[model samples]
Target: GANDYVPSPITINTSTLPVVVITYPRVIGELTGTSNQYIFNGGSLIALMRGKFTPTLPKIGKITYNFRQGNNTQSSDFDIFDTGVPGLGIIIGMAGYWPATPLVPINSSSIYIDPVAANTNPNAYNGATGSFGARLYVAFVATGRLPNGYVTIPTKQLGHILLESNRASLNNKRLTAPVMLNGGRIQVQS
Candidate 1:
C-alpha cells in the first residue's frame, strides 16, 4: 500500500536550476554491474546521467541526456517530462549534428535500444513539480546506455533541482541497485 512506505525527504535546488546533463551508464540491467556485452566506441551512441550540480538558471527544470556523436558544448532547447519510469527517455526534437547510429561495430545487448530508430513511446513529465496526471507505462528495450561524464547542459544555469540521493528509496534509489523499479520527478519554478 502507498501508506506502507513514506516519501523520502527529497530536496530540489530552488535557488536556481543549472544546465543539467544526464549520461547513461555503460552497464545495464535493473541492478548495478549488469554487463550487457556490447562494443561502445568512444563516439558511439550513449546515455547521459549525473556529473555536476549548480544553482544559477531561472524558470528551468531538470534535463535528461545521452551521449551521441556530437560536440559536448552544444546546447539545445527541449521539453522534459516524466515517463513514469526510472529512466528519463530522451527524444531529439530536431535533426542535429549528432548521428543516430553507432560509429563503431558492436554487439546487441538485452537493454540496448537502436539509436537509428525512434522510441515507440515518447512521453515527458513536468520537469518542475511532479505531475501525478502523467502516469503511463510502456515496455521497450533501451537502444544504448548512457556513457559516463556526459553533461545535459553545458551552460551555467540553476533552479530548484533534485540531486541523486545516497539512500535507496522508490524513485531516489540508483537504477543499478537492488530496489523497486521507479522514476523521479523534478519541480522547477521560473
Candidate 2:
C-alpha cells in the first residue's frame, strides 16, 4: 500500500508584509523538484524526493549556500524552480528581515535555476467552487543575523509566508531565523 500522501497547506495573511505564494504538486515517494522563478537566499533547504534529510549551511551575509542534487553540488546565494502547485509560496527566512525598511530588490541573477516545466500551471488545482485541491507547496529561505552574530525571524511576520509552521532560535543571542520557507503550496485532493 502507498503511504497516505499529505499535501502541505499554507495561508498568508498580508496584514503586515506583502508576500508571494507558490504551490507544487505532490511527489508521493520522492521530493526532487524546484519552484518557479523566485529569489533564494541564505535560508534555503532542499528536501530529497525519498524524504532523506539534506544538509544545510548556516546563513551568513553574501555567502552562498551549496545546493546538492544527489552527487552534484552548486554554490549559490539562492535558487528558483517550479512547484507543481497552482499558486506562489514565498517563505521569507530570518535574513529577510532587514530593519523593516523598503522592499529588498530581488535581482534575477541572485538565483540559479533552469526553465520551468512546460505543463506547470496553478489553474489545474482550482476546484469547481473556486477552491484549491488538497495539495501543498513550500519554499525555503534564511533570516539574517542579529546584533550579536545570531539568526532570527520576526515572529510577527512568521505566518505571513503561510507554510512556515515551525521556527527555531539560535544560541542565546536570538538572531533572526537563519532559514525559512519562502515559496510553497497545497491543493485540494480528489
Candidate 3:
C-alpha cells in the first residue's frame, strides 16, 4: 500500500551527447544493513547502502535511463544514523547530477524521512528488506525521455556511484522528500 516514487532533475539533450555508463560488476554489497543512500538528478535516480553493511546481499542491477557522459566525473557518498526515536527515520546525505552542458545541476539534501510502503515513496526501506525480501539495486534509465516533457539525455559516461538503496529505518511513514537547494528557501521534495 505505497504511493508512487518518482525521481526528479530531468534533463533535455538539445542534440547528441556522450554516453556515460557507471558499471558495477555484480555489485559488492547488495544486502547491507543500517542505511540507504539515494541520488536523483539528470533524469537519473540511484541508491546505495552505508553503515553496518553486512552479509553479502543480492540485487538486480539493470536500471538504465540517462547515466551516460564523460569528463569531470563526479563521486559522492552517504551516511545514515538512527534517531533513537520510535516510528521515525532520518537521513543526511549529498547527491549529485550530470553537470555540464545541455542540462542543469541538481543537488538536494534529504531530511526527515518516513518508513517506506503504503506510500511507495521510495525513500529508505528498513532493515527488513524489499517486497518478498529483495530490492532493486541500481535502476538508471540509460535512454528515453519522460512523458511529462522531461529531458531525454543521451546515455553518456557512467555515474560515480551506484543507483538505488535499501536502508533500515524506524517505524514511521513517508520516507523520502528531497529538499531543493535553490536560493535560501529550503523545500522538501516528495
Candidate 4:
C-alpha cells in the first residue's frame, strides 16, 4: 500500500535545491603480486548531484561530476528521470571517466557519497535521511614494471570494478571510507 510509506516532498528550486557530492579518496596498501591488482590510481576526484524542477510534482534532476586532475578538470552530467514504465520509476544516473592519458601510479584511493536533502526517490535511498547511495562502476588498465625499468601497459579493460556502499546514508553530512569494493584486488595501481 502507498500508505505504508510516506513520501516527503523536496522543494524543487534550482538555487535552494540541495546538492549531493561524491568523492574518491586515495588508495592505500601494498601491491602483493600479479595475482592481486588495483584499478584507479586514486587521488582528487569528485561528483555532485542535484535536482532541477520541471514545473510539476516529483521534480527532475541529475548527477553532476567534475573529474579533476590538478588545474584541469573534466565535467560530465547525467540526467535523473522517470522511465514512466513499470518496475523502473526514476532512473538513477551513473557516469564514469577514463583519462585520455594514463594517470600517475598511486598507492591508495577511496570513494564517498553525500546526500544534502532527503531523496525523493527510493532507488537511491540507503535506509537513511537525505541519502541516495550509489555503486561506482570502474574500468582500468593493468600496469607492470619490466626488469629494465620500463613498465608494461596492458591495453585492455583490466577489470570492471563495482564499489558497493560507496556512499552511505546520512542527513546533511559527509561520509568517507577506503575503497571497499572486492573481487579482483584490494589496492589499485595505474
Candidate 5:
C-alpha cells in the first residue's frame, strides 16, 4: 500500500540564460515513531538533519547543491526546515539548476536517503523503541538549450544510495534526530 501512490513527474527546460527549478518527488513519509537522525543524499546534493527532537520531528537544516563544469565548481546552500514540513512527508522544496554555459548534454542524476537512526524514540515513545519506517523520492531536472528548442529533462528513477556517516562524525557526536542508544544505554523496542 505504501508504494501505490506515484506522484506526477516534474520537468524543467534549459536556456541560454541561467535557469533553475526545484527537485521533485520529494516525499519523506513513515517517520511517525523512529530514530530521527537521517540523511538525504542526492549525489552532488545532500541534506543533513537538524533541529530539536519532537514527535513530529520538524526537519531543519541545510541542503547543498554542487555543480561542476570542468573544474569550475559551484555550490549553494539552502535551508531545509523552512522550505517544507517534515511531518507531512514533504522533505525539500529547494531549487537546483544547470548554469548557462557552453557545456552540453547535461544528464539527470539519482538521489538516496538513509534513516541513520530509525526506530529511536527521541520522544521517548514506547520506551524509546517506537516503530519507524520511511520512503522518499528524490530527483533533479536537466535544462539546456537544444538546437531544436529549450527542453527540461526530468531524471530517471533514483536508486537508493548508501548512507554517509562521515559527515555525521564531524559534528559533536550528537544525533540530529533520535537514536537507538541514549545516555550510553541501548534502548529496547516496545
Candidate 6:
C-alpha cells in the first residue's frame, strides 16, 4: 500500500519550509524531423519526486500549474496521494494531453496538463555513490523501471532528485510513441 511519491528522501513536512520549484524555462535545441511535432522549443514543465531512504516525498501534495507556451495560456492542477494499493498504488488523477487531446496545431490540436514528452535528463540519476537527480516523469509510473544510471547518492532506498525514467512513460499524440520537448519548465510555487 505504498503509492505516495517521495519528495525528499529524509525530510518531513514542516511549517514555513521554503518552497522549491524546477526551472529550465530557456530551452536550447534545434527542431527537426517528425520528432519536432512533439519536441517543442516552446518550453518545459516538470514535477520532482523526493522521499525517504529515511525521509519522505509528499504525504499529501497538491500541484497547480498556471503557464503557457505556443498555444493559449492554460492552468490546471494534478494532485498526488496514496490509493492504498500495492506496487503501482499511485495513480494519476484525470489524464490529459496526447490521444486524450491532441496537442497544438503543429500536427493538429493540443492537449492539457500532462504533455507526452519523452523529455527529462538522462544524466539525472547518478545511481552509484553521490547525490542524484530525480525528475517528474516517474510520477506514479514506477521506479524499478529506472536504468542502471547511478551516482554517489546517500540513499537509493531513501531520497534523491530525478526526472521521468530514461524514456518517458507518456505516449505520443497518435498513440504511436513517446513525446518530448526541448526545455521549457513549469514553476512550482508553494
Best by TM-score: 2
Candidate 5 has a TM-score of: 0.18
Which pairs clash in the backbone of model 5?
Answer: 12-152, 13-152, 14-144, 35-119, 35-120, 36-178
Between candidates 1 and 2, the one scoring higher on TM-score is: 2
Model 3 C-alpha lDDT per residue in residues 7-52, reported as the tens digit of each score = 2221122122222222221111111111122322221222232111
Q: Can you tell me which runs of candidate 4 are displaced by over 4 Å?
A: 1-130, 145-178, 185-190
- Compared with the true structure, model 6 gives a TM-score of 0.19
Flag regions of model 5 displaced more than 4 Å.
Answer: 1-132, 135-139, 146-155, 161-190
* Residue 129 in candidate 1, Cα distance off native in Å: 44
- Candidate 5 local accuracy as lDDT? 0.22
* Regions of candidate 6 where Cα sits further than 4 Å from its true position: 1-35, 38-62, 79-175, 180-190
How far is 90's C-alpha from truth in model 6 (Å)? 16
Worst 10 residues of 3 by lDDT: 26-35
Q: By descending TM-score, how would the candidates be arranged? A: 2, 4, 6, 5, 1, 3
User: What shift in Å separates residue 3 of candidate 4 from its native position after superposition?
Assistant: 24
Q: Compared with the true structure, what per-residue lDDT tens digits does model 1 show for residues 1-190?
A: 2112222211212123222333332111111111111111121222221111112222112333332323234433322322222333322121111243222111111111222122232221112221111001111112234334322322221111122212234234322211111223232121
> What does the lDDT come to for candidate 2?
0.21
Better of 2 and 6 by TM-score: 2
Better of 2 and 4 by TM-score: 2
Greater TM-score among 3 and 5 belongs to: 5
Which residue segments of model 3 deviate by more than 4 Å?
A: 1-151, 154-170, 178-190
**Residue-pair clashes, model 6:** 48
Per-candidate Cα lDDT values, in order, are: 0.22, 0.21, 0.22, 0.22, 0.22, 0.22
Q: For each candidate, C-alpha RMSD in Å?
A: 19.4, 20.9, 19.1, 20.9, 20.6, 19.2
In model 1, state the lDDT of residue 6.
Answer: 21
Per-residue lDDT tens digits for candidate 4, residues 1-190, read 2112111221111121112111121111112111111121222222232211121112234434332321225534423222222111121211222222122111112112222121243333223222222222222111122122222222221112222232332112222222221222112123
Candidate with the larger TM-score of 3 and 4: 4
